[PDB]
Design an enzyme around this catalytic site. Structure first.
Site, short mmCIF file in Angstrom:
data_model
loop_
_atom_site.label_atom_id
_atom_site.label_comp_id
_atom_site.label_asym_id
_atom_site.label_seq_id
_atom_site.Cartn_x
_atom_site.Cartn_y
_atom_site.Cartn_z
N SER A 189 81.70 -0.42 21.24
CA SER A 189 81.47 -1.33 20.70
C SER A 189 80.30 -2.19 20.68
O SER A 189 79.78 -2.40 22.03
N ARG A 190 79.23 -2.00 19.85
CA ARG A 190 77.96 -2.87 20.18
C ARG A 190 77.88 -4.61 19.21
O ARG A 190 76.59 -4.90 19.23
N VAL A 191 78.76 -5.20 18.97
CA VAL A 191 79.27 -6.10 18.35
C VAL A 191 80.09 -6.86 19.16
O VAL A 191 80.38 -8.23 19.82
#
Lengths: 169, 120, 116, 120, 265, 48, 253, 85, 168, 116
Positions: I119-121
């Protein structure tokens, strides 16, 4: 190649490495398949070569395991030894075909384990000599296999006995 | 000195007193003693470096005073056996066992060890 | 066989099989040493290493570039030389001895040179 | 940047994001223009387009732009022409990594993969 | 094709790397126990050696050799085989007792006449007195060990924790013990048969030490070997990786040619 | 009975006194086989 | 070899080394050296020019320039034009040398032109006349005959091996044309050998009747010896005989 | 399988075994064999016919040929006209 | 989705699967004779997909505090995450979930491999409670992965402890 | 799961895991050997080998191929028969007496056939 494979009733894959390995003619028996399958081949020869496929298939699995040099149980080495002899049987001289009447004995010997006994180096000697022995003595047996093309009880017993008689050449 | 080693582990290491039950009765070693080889019998052993004494139960072995006053004791498996009636029950089984068979030697050992247990 | 003769053909057959084996065990050898492979095979492998080196002969035209005067050996001699090598008769001498030289006799002689 | 450099005599620093996506965008425009997409998809005018971009960034006698670019290597395949062409223009590479950040070190730059052709 | 066969082979190489890594770790675990044993055993042996030295005891024959059931420990099996073969030149008629499958197989091949007794189920275990004692009991009865006034044992001395030199030593028969130069300073007793007891006792006590030394060398060699294996696999990863990357580019190119050919029409 | 077999039995017997240790039990249990040989020919492997 | 491993530097050293004969008194010992810069940063080349003028060699040398920005057809015609200049010296019989850095980048330029001329893509998408271009270029550099006054025009062309894949189409095509190769081993370059010219894969096909007799005598068999070093270090990674150790110690040294 | 690794030779072996019935009186087991050679040089074909004559099987053999030199239409048409025979 | 989003409401749009959308665009392009891009999938497919995927967003509070959460689905070509359409989409997306076939067979059904999920958030939006009790879990599982292949004899207690916690 | 029967599903899940384990463990057996497999692992392998050939059954259309007349084994019977194997009730039956035969009753009958 994709197109042709679909078209044909069977495929007879050959392997170059196995040619060099000395199985010349070289048949890649793993990829030699007949989708339609077999029903055309001499009835006698069909009886004898029944477990030839199983032995070889087992030999292939066993051989892979064997070259890791990992500890092999006797059962695998029965296969390995048997498999090795079979491979040596497969090799054949260019431009020399062999009559079916004289292929039935050789497969009988192998499948009935007589060949499995005799040593790898002298398999070629055994093959030549066994045939000579049958030509000399059980030439009646050869005539019958030629004439009737399916093995009777008498022929199977005769053949078993013949192989036994000449078992250690 | 007196030095005792064993196959899992051994430690022993001059005028001290060792008291041993040996295939020569019981032997006491005090400082220098004559250089000897004695087979150690399954034994209860007391070892005293100075006046301080540590008590060992020993499975038989060999005892050897070297000429350089190194008392080489080699024994197998412990005074830990002092934790100690299953051995008496096992001696009963073993006695029965002698009827069939090594079991004779086992039962002989069971009596010897049982005696040694009774001593400790 | 019978084009170059059965004896020649047999000799060549064994070479082909041997070299193919040697190529086959190249993977296994690299991942794990030859000492962890079968002893019998290890002899074959050592023989094949020798055969490979035996195959080199300096060029008789690039004598300058090779830095060794060329070697051309009789066909009749060649068959004899390989036959011996396959029976490992003289095999017991350096890889270097086999490398860049002519006949079996030359290899043997160069072994004497190397030995000194 | 050039107005700053040339006409305000400034040193500037020009960040670019993915130059992979610069290439990718150029490749698409090429394909749309109907020019034969050269090897590994990328435009046949890949080199020339980089040439203009990376020779308009220089030290003039007024100032100098300097450019930090981000190269999103596709599967780390540096052999792919788009990374290769980029590396040709690049003078130094600073090789940020997350492993280094995980050794607590921020700067998170790889100690021996950070290399410059200006370190001499 | 190229791509999948490359990829599958590279996956194999990766899995091999992981396994050789894994094996190396397990080898280390085993190695700790092995070395510990070798120390304790050797200390005990040294207590006996003090006697043999001071006695200056010295001295068909027996050959006993030890290499575990398991292989891929390196060349422990075959360096020992070579060193057995060297002393089999010396006495061709010597009876070899092979302790564990690897030494059994290799020696059995060179001479099967010698093989009279052999053991199994030793290699997987860490050496124990129980084994030595029972093997010894069988050695006297089966091999008529006492008949041979020479006994010799072969094992692998773990020279360094990165090396092993195959080694042999002579076990002292009861005849030897009798005639030992100094034996008079030591007290003999007619109510003891100290040669017949000490022979038997040192047959096992020496053998257990030899086994501990061998096991340690074996496990140490295996750790070394399995480490070197991981390295060899890494190299194979690198060559197939470059090939993989090249192959990927090539597929794109071949596909592209088809598209261009289509476009041209 | 041989002296070292006798002593072996003594050591084994001595570990069962009333208290026990796994390492002790491991030191006193072994599974092995005398794969009996002959001058090639193999009499059946008799367990240790 | 691989670019910017100081690929350029190898050539610079040659030009400088022969400064003593290029500042010599015999013009048939003066190589007038031409540096063709194709596909290079105009800044970097300018620094190179300054390097040359620092080593005061510029006055006997020409710089032809076809920078990275410069137009792709111009880049295509850039080596050929330079060679025309080279031939005038050659056809004065006078010694000369020409360094084409980097012809691999010229291939990409010709590729662009060809593709935009809709010539059908060849292997690796490089046009089929890429061979014709290179062969035509290379064969215009020569050591002429005594009749022609023995005009040397020594060609040194620098090929940028992407990933060190020397099986690649453009490299193999070049290899087949060129007399010898000076393969550079990147691993060794990194590993402190500077310059790191692996000699296992470097050949020269007529060098053995070029260099002075002194450098034939002294250097005799060293090629063999260090290809014994290659063999020795092949199997170095166990037992080493004193003979093997001697070679290894000598080889390393 | 891989080209000319006795690729021809496997087929020729079959032809040789077809001697046993063909020469034999069994006319319902008599296979007249048609060897089609497409794209092969005249010399190759010529060697084959010599082998066939050596084994004297060239009496029931028909060799329909379209060598590499022989035209591409004729080569295309060659399997189909062999089929007709 | 825009209507809901624009009204300030929230919603979740699951585009399943963009891979077949790609094929359709390919069909269109080929039929319109517009040249097909890399791997014979239209060249500006990147532009189309990116345009679609950027119409999913968390709007500002002046834009009525609303959103359109999205979860595009891409079907791998036998686990091939390299391929023009996967590579492009991977670049566009902020996060990935990579389901693992081995795990499916191995009875984690549904199967997810969280090593290859990213997950980049991520945790920027997470329940606070759930943050507290789940930092450890990432690390424990990470160790469990490493000691997974050490689960094939004579095992150190530390590794064995990790292995027990991880398996449970 | 429940759709095909919760019991059926669970049994089949156990079969799948057993087979999947077996396939993975073949690699371990290949290099390392079967010595590094635990008793539990070994039992799973033995069951898998039996199951692998329990699946093998003849068909009516391989009367032609072989001669053996097909084994039409009802679904309910199969769930039971496979369940039995997993429970280990017929792990006292040889692997080859699972090979190329019908249901559990037949497997028992072929055990008798090999037995005498």
């Amino acid at each position: 190649p994709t197109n042709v494979i679909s078209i044909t009733d069977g495929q007879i894959f050959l392997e170059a490495e196995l040619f060099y390995k000395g199985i010349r003619p070289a048949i890649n028996v793993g990829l030699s398949v007949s989708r339609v399958g077999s029903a055309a081949q001499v009835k006698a020869l069909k009886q004898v070569a029944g477990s030839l496929k199983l032995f070889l298939a087992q030999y292939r699995e066993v051989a892979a395991f064997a070259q890791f040099g990992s500890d092999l149980d006797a059962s695998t080495k029965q296969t390995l030894v048997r498999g090795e002899r079979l491979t040596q049987l497969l090799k054949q001289n260019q431009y020399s075909p062999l009559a079916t009447e004289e292929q039935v004995p050789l497969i009988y010997a192998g499948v009935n384990g007589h060949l499995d006994g005799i040593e790898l180096s002298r398999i070629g000697e055994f093959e030549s000599s066994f045939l000579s022995y049958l030509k000399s003595n059980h030439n009646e047996l050869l005539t019958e296999i030629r004439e009737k093309g399916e093995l009777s009880k008498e022929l199977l017993a005769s053949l078993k006995s013949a192989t036994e008689s000449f078992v250690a050449t | 000195k007196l030095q005792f080693a064993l196959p899992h582990e051994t430690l022993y290491s001059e005028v001290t007193q060792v008291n041993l039950p040996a295939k020569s009765g019981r032997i006491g070693v005090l400082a220098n003693h004559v250089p000897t080889v004695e087979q150690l019998l399954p034994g209860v052993v007391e070892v005293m470096e100075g006046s301080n004494s540590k008590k060992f139960f020993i499975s038989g072995g060999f005892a050897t005073v070297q000429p350089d006053s190194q008392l080489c004791v080699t024994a197998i498996e412990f005074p830990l056996e002092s934790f100690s009636e299953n051995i008496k029950n096992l001696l009963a089984e073993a006695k029965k066992n002698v009827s069939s068979s090594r079991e004779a030697a086992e039962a002989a050992i069971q009596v010897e060890v049982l005696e040694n247990l009774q001593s400790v | 066989a019978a084009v170059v003769g059965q004896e020649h053909y047999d000799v060549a057959s064994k070479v082909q099989e041997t070299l193919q084996t040697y190529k086959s065990l190249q993977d296994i050898i690299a991942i794990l040493g030859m000492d962890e492979l079968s002893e019998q095979d290890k002899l074959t492998v050592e023989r094949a290493r020798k055969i490979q080196r035996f195959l080199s002969q300096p060029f008789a035209v690039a004598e300058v570039f090779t830095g060794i005067p060329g070697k051309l050996v009789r066909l009749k001699d060649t068959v004899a030389s390989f036959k011996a090598v396959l029976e490992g008769k003289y095999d017991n001498i350096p890889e270097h001895a086999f490398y860049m030289v002519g006949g079996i006799e030359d290899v043997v002689a160069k072994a004497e040179k190397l030995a000194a | 940047a050039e107005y700053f450099r040339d006409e305000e005599g400034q040193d500037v620093l020009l960040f670019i994001d993915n130059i992979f996506r610069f290439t990718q965008a150029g490749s698409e425009v090429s394909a749309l223009l109907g020019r034969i997409p050269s090897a590994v998809g990328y435009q046949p005018t890949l080199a020339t387009d980089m040439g203009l971009l990376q020779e308009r960034i220089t030290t003039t006698k007024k100032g100098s732009v300097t450019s930090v670019q981000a190269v999103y290597v596709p599967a780390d395949d540096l052999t792919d022409p788009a990374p290769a062409t980029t590396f040709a223009h690049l003078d130094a590479t600073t090789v940020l990594s997350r492993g280094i950040s995980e050794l607590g070190i921020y700067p998170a730059v790889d100690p021996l993969d950070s290399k410059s052709r200006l370190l001499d | 094709a190229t791509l999948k066969e490359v990829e599958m082979r590279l996956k194999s190489i990766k899995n091999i790397e992981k396994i050789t890594k894994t094996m190396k770790i397990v080898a280390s675990t085993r190695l700790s126990k092995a070395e510990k044993a070798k120390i304790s055993a050797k200390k005990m042996d040294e207590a006996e050696q003090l006697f043999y030295k001071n006695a200056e005891t010295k001295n068909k024959e027996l050959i006993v050799a030890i290499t575990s059931d398991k292989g891929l420990c390196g060349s422990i099996h075959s360096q020992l085989a070579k060193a057995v073969r060297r002393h089999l030149n010396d006495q061709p008629n010597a009876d070899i007792v092979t302790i564990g499958d690897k030494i059994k197989m290799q020696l059995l091949r060179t001479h099967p006449n010698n093989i009279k007794l052999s053991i199994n189920g030793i290699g997987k275990d860490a050496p124990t007195f129980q084994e030595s004692a029972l093997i010894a009991d069988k050695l006297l009865s089966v091999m008529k060990a006492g008949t041979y006034p020479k006994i010799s044992i072969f094992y692998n001395d773990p020279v360094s924790s990165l090396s092993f030199e195959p080694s042999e030593k002579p076990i002292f028969n009861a005849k030897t013990i009798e005639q030992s130069p100094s034996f008079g300073k030591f007290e003999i007793d007619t109510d003891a048969n100290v040669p017949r007891d000490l022979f038997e006792y040192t047959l096992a006590n020496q053998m257990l030490t030899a086994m501990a030394q061998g096991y340690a060398a074996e496990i140490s060699a295996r750790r070394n070997a399995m480490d070197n294996a991981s390295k060899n696999a890494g190299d194979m990863i690198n060559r197939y990786s470059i090939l993989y990357n090249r192959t990927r580019q090539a597929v794109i190119t071949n596909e592209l040619v088809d598209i261009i050919t289509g476009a041209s029409s | 009975i041989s002296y070292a077999a006798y002593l072996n039995v003594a050591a084994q017997a001595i570990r069962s006194t009333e208290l026990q240790t796994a390492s002790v039990l491991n030191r006193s249990q072994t599974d092995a086989f005398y794969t009996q040989y002959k001058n090639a020919s193999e009499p059946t492997p008799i367990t240790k | 070899g691989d670019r910017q491993t100081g690929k350029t530097a190898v050539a610079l050293d040659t030009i400088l080394n022969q400064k003593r004969w290029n500042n010599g008194s015999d013009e048939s010992k003066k190589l007038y050296c031409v540096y063709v810069a194709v596909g290079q940063k105009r800044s970097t080349v300018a620094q190179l020019v300054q390097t040359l003028e620092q080593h005061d060699a510029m006055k006997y040398s020409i710089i032809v320039a076809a920078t990275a920005s410069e137009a792709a057809p111009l880049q295509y015609l850039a080596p050929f034009t330079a060679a025309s200049i080279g031939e005038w010296f050659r056809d004065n019989g006078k010694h000369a040398l020409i360094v084409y850095d980097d012809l691999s980048k010229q291939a990409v330029a010709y590729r662009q032109l060809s593709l935009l001329l809709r010539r059908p893509p060849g292997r690796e998408a490089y046009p089929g006349d890429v061979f014709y271009l290179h062969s035509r270029l290379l064969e215009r550099a020569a050591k002429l005959s005594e009749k022609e006054g023995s005009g040397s025009l020594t060609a040194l062309p620098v090929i940028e091996t992407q990933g060190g894949d020397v099986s690649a189409y453009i490299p193999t095509n070049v290899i087949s044309i060129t007399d010898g190769q000076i393969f550079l081993e990147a691993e060794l370059f990194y590993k402190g050998i500077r310059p790191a010219i692996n000699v296992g894969l470097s050949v020269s096909r007529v060098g053995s009747a070029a260099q002075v007799k002194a450098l034939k005598q002294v250097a005799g068999s060293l090629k063999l010896f260090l290809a014994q070093y290659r063999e020795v270090a092949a199997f170095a990674q166990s037992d080493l005989d004193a003979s093997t150790k001697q070679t290894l110690v000598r080889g390393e040294r």
